[PDB]
């Protein structure tokens, strides 16, 4: 003869909880007594516990326990039991076709009730669980109900049918019937549902032509009506009427005028207006626009209109608050491959975003920006990309490298620049650049025979201060080697040489090997190079021989090996050195 706790009461009890262990206790002790309460299957209190349970669940606990009995509520006569019940269903159910049928049953039995909100629960629930078989059953029932004009219900129905379609594509047929009239209704609610209903319907080419040619004009009027006038204590949300309605509408308009002149040609008006006539104040509106734009895009329309659309997004970018800006970019990309020449009118501001404090934005910004790189463009944008790259965060650096390279590799002016930039990147990311770089860049240098100087030159400078970096150093050491000749304050064109004391050339190379920051491979290019100089200079031809012979004894099988090799070259067949080194071959793409 029990004394059953009441929902809240319960919770309020778990609030007293002082130890996770305890929580179990309480809970375990509860459901325990609760189970022993179902043993008897007592119609009263039934509802209560189910709730208690629900909560219990919500806090991540043993749930399955009463899935069933939950349904036994649905059964009950008294409304309450039914709503609490239903709710419980949507939460605790696994998709067993078995209960699914029992479900089906009660749904119908309830779908045809004297009261109405009952019917509510039903519909609702059905649009949230509706598994194939279900719908395949109640389907029609949905129509019978779809008809009766009791706004409340109708809307509910509408959606149901929808859901049905989604789970059973095969049945939208029987809905043509509700169709025709729908877009004339007066209560927003319905109208709205009605819309998406239509929207989703149009996923079968044929129906299209039906609504396509039909409702288009009407849709317009409705929308127009809205935008254009009055404040509405029932609908407004910061100055505009049923944004939702407005949006969804757009959507549908959009989808309909997919590929077609007639439709579109008949829409571009309302659209434009929507643009000009809406409030940029706060998000809400913008939301409106966001959608309108997308729509305006997928459909054929005067070049002038599309133009507006774009210029509109730009208008976003410059908005105080993040959010907006996001989509702004997103969509922007989806169209760059289409309205290229048009979007360009904003890059300036776009890349200007890279300066933002939100990763997503950043990236997108980048991605896009990149894509806009033209021919006559490069120079500028690069200068900016570079600034960017230098201070960037890890994540990005890696990817950007890849990016810039491309730019230069494709659209690109002078080698000097190309190099200059590539180098530049090395200077900052290197540790992140891929592998082919080293050869890449060299191949560029070698191929174009002028900047040989300008290069070893800058190469030198950079390496003097820096050491941190690998690819860079390597490349340099390379040329320094093969190019020492030119490195000696030569009659240099393209620009102004500087001070090249052979002693200095060495000092650097030397340190390279010594300092621990270089890879054995690195040390390589170096040494090898140092010798390449023996043939490329006039006097320190002695400090050289010294170094070589000293490295003849280094752990690095390689270095040593070579060292000995070289060492021996001097000690015996001198003059061969001249012919040996003085010639670096050349590979061409």
């Amino acid at each position: 003869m029990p004394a059953p706790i009441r929902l809240r009461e319960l919770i309020r009890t778990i609030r007293t909880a002082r130890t996770q262990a305890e929580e179990r206790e309480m809970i375990q002790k509860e459901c325990a007594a609760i189970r022993s309460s179902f043993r008897e299957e007592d119609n009263t209190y039934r509802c209560r516990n189910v709730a208690k349970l629900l909560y219990m669940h919500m806090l991540g606990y043993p749930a399955h326990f009463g899935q069933l009995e939950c349904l036994k509520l649905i059964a009950s006569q008294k409304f309450t039991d039914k709503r609490i019940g239903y709710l419980g269903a949507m939460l605790l159910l696994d998709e067993r076709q078995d209960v699914h049928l029992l479900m089906t049953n009660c749904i119908k039995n309830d779908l045809n009730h004297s009261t109405q909100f009952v019917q509510g629960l039903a519909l609702c629930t059905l649009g949230c669980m509706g598994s194939s078989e279900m719908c395949r059953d109640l389907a029609g029932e949905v129509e019978k109900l779809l008809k009766t004009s009791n706004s409340y219900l109708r809307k509910k129905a509408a959606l149901c049918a929808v859901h049905v379609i989604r789970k059973v594509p095969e049945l939208m047929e029987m809905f043509l019937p509700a169709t025709k009239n729908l877009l004339n209704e007066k209560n927003h609610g319905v109208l709205h549902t009605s819309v998406v209903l239509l929207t989703e319907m149009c996923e079968r080419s044929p129906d299209m032509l039906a609504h396509f040619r039909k409702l288009v004009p009407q849709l317009v009027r409705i929308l127009k009506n809205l935008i254009m006038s009055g404040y509405s204590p029932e609908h407004d949300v910061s100055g505009i009427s049923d944004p939702f309605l407005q949006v969804r509408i757009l959507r549908l308009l959009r989808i309909l005028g997919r590929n077609d002149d007639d439709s579109s040609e008949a829409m571009n008006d309302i659209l434009a207006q929507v643009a000009t006539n809406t409030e940029t104040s706060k998000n809400v509106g913008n939301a409106i626009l966001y959608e309108t734009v997308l729509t305006i895009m997928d459909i054929k329309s005067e070049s002038g209109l599309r133009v507006l659309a774009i210029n509109i997004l730009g208008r976003f970018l410059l908005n105080n608050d993040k959010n907006i800006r996001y989509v702004a970019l997103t969509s922007l990309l989806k169209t760059v491959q289409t309205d290229h020449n048009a979007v360009q009118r904003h890059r300036s501001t776009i890349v200007d975003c890279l300066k933002d404090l939100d990763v997503s934005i950043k990236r997108r910004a980048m991605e896009l920006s990149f894509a806009l790189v033209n021919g006559n463009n490069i120079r500028g944008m690069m200068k900016e990309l570079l600034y960017f790259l230098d201070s960037c965060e890890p994540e990005f650096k890696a990817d950007c490298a890849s990016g810039i390279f491309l730019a230069a590799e494709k659209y690109a002016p002078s080698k000097r620049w190309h190099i200059d930039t590539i180098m530049r990147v090395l200077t900052t990311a290197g540790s992140y650049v891929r592998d082919d770089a080293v050869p890449n860049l060299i191949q560029l240098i070698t191929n174009s025979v002028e900047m040989h100087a300008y290069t070893v030159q800058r190469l030198y400078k950079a390496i003097l201060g820096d050491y941190s970096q690998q690819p860079l150093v390597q490349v340099a050491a390379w040329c320094i080697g093969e190019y020492g000749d030119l490195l000696v304050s030569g009659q240099c064109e393209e620009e102004e040489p500087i001070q090249v004391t052979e002693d200095e050339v060495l000092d650097i190379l030397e340190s390279v090997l010594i300092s621990n920051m270089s890879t054995s491979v690195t040390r390589g290019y170096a040494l090898t190079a140092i010798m390449k100089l023996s043939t490329r200079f006039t006097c320190t031809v002695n400090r050289i021989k010294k170094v070589v012979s000293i490295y003849g004894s280094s752990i690095d099988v390689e270095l040593q090996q070579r060292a000995v090799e070289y060492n021996a070259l001097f000690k015996k067949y001198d003059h061969m050195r001249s012919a040996l080194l003085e010639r670096m071959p050349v590979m061409e793409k």
């Binding site: 519909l123 609702c124 949230c128 509706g130 549902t193 609908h235 907006i324």
Partner: protein, 148 residues
Amino acid sequence: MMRFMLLFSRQGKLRLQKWYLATSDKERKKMVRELMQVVLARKPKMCSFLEWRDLKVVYKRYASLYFCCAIEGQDNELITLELIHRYVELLDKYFGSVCELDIIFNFEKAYFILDEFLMGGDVQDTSKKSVLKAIEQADLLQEEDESP
């Protein structure tokens, strides 16, 4: 369409879940937590849209309470946002200057309200009142069940 929605506070405490697409319980809790962590984890400075598992998610921070949901890429993030703010709206005028606690103690209702605002992944009404007005009379019926 809405794929689902959740209600949890700063700390990963579930205060209200509602699934609009069949799914195994396990997978759900997964979905949940998996998200919460990566959800919350973000600084308040950042934005409100994330691309997760193919779907688009959204949220707005209301005091110590989080509002989240997921959408299909081919959908309007912003507007969605405004939806949330609508729900809250409801919640507010129903309990009178509502607050977390309430939501924990009366989720049941919370559901109903919501449940009778959105259905099968969409908007069934917009009318701030249509909903209230309805939800209300419903309640009246309820009362009349215990007290004849």
